[PDB]
């Protein structure tokens, strides 16, 4: 009857999601309501700033997207997906979109601020995580993917760079740039090279199974300290991914290796998460036998690593980036393209 409680939790979560999916929150703040403090991150799409909402004094991470760059990069549809989805979802290991708005030049997404840093920085410093440490994080992603997939969402960008550590040592998935709501197959080449399932590389038409492959990549990297498929250039990584070979460090437990062989499975009829038992082939695997799935959800397990608190607006867990100034044009750009934002 564990399974019946999960079903009804998920049915209730779908009614909650669909209301917001159908009637999206829109224009819920303005730039002028925020004091900009420091640039705390950038990707190849825009830039993220620590801001302070002046009316409440709360700190947030504000993603700024230049509409003209989104259009030139052909990321219109993905950006509409990203915001529509993130404003609709509600799960403990998903970063919260607090406000969104746009002006003549930019789109803005204001999310909860996580001063503890990304998993990526902690992993590189420490080298690798212990099996128990990796398992605590992996558990949160298993639940998160069970949630997302139940809403017909594919995530498509799992990696330590997209996982932030909150003040209890739990994680939040924090970038929804390539998330999509789709029934059936989708075809876009997207993701991060090290994490791409073979059916993406091969232009084959794919589904949520790509997320579970990616979870295998994450668990491997967390526990080894390096990815299962690495090379100096992407085409060399793809050749390795599509070969069907993986080698495991000698310190990997036999249960870990068996899990990973089932997730890093080129054969879609055999990949864990994509069989008739679904996510339960994972949650019941021997590597997960000590994981109390409900206690993880409720955040009652003691975290293996709590980042040291230094203030709600401290930025010492992020690198320094060059400051650039936000320029807002007196003419509206790309109005029609982003009307639903």
């Amino acid at each position: 009857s564990e399974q019946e409680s999960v079903k009804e939790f998920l049915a209730k979560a779908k009614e909650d999601f669909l209301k917001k999916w159908e009637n999206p929150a829109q224009n819920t703040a303005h730039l002028d309501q925020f004091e900009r403090i420091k640039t705390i991150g950038t990707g190849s799409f825009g830039r993220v700033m620590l801001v302070k909402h002046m009316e409440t004094g709360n700190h947030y991470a504000m993603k700024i997207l230049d509409k003209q760059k989104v259009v030139k990069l052909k990321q219109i549809e993905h950006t509409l997906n990203e915001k529509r989805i993130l404003q609709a979802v509600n799960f403990p290991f998903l970063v919260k979109l607090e406000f969104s708005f746009k002006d003549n030049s930019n789109l803005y997404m204001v999310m909860e601020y996580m001063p503890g840093g990304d998993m990526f920085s902690h992993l590189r410093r420490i080298g690798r995580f212990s099996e128990p440490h990796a398992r605590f994080y992996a558990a949160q992603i298993v639940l998160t993917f069970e949630y997302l997939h139940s809403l017909d969402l594919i995530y498509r960008d799992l990696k330590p760079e997209n996982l932030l550590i909150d003040q209890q040592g739990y994680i939040k998935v924090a970038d929804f740039g390539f998330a999509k709501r789709v029934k059936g197959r989708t075809w876009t080449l997207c993701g991060t090279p090290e994490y791409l399932a073979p059916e993406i590389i091969l232009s084959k038409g794919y589904n949520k199974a790509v997320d579970w492959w990616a979870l295998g990549v994450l668990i491997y990297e967390m526990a080894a300290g390096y990815p299962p498929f690495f090379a100096d250039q992407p085409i060399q990584i793809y050749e390795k991914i599509v070969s069907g070979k993986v080698r495991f460090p000698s310190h990997f437990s036999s249960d870990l290796k068996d899990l990973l062989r089932n997730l890093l499975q080129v054969d879609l009829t055999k990949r864990f998460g994509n069989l008739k038992n679904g996510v339960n082939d994972i949650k019941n695997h021997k590597w997960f036998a000590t994981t109390d799935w409900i206690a993880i959800y409720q955040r009652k397990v003691e975290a293996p690593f709590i980042p040291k608190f230094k203030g709600p607006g401290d930025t010492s867990n992020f690198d320094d980036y060059e400051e650039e100034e936000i320029r807002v044009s007196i003419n509206e750009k790309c109005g029609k393209e982003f009307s639903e934002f």
């Binding site: 990707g43 990069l73 080298g127 080449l189 300290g225 690495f230 090379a231 100096d232 250039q233 460090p249």
Partner: peptide
């Protein structure tokens, strides 16, 4: 060691997603 190969490689920093 494989780990020494990784940390000397071209892709140890934050990795971007792929485009178009």
């Amino acid at each position: 060691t494989t780990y020494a190969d990784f940390i000397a490689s071209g892709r140890t920093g934050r990795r971007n997603a792929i485009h178009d």
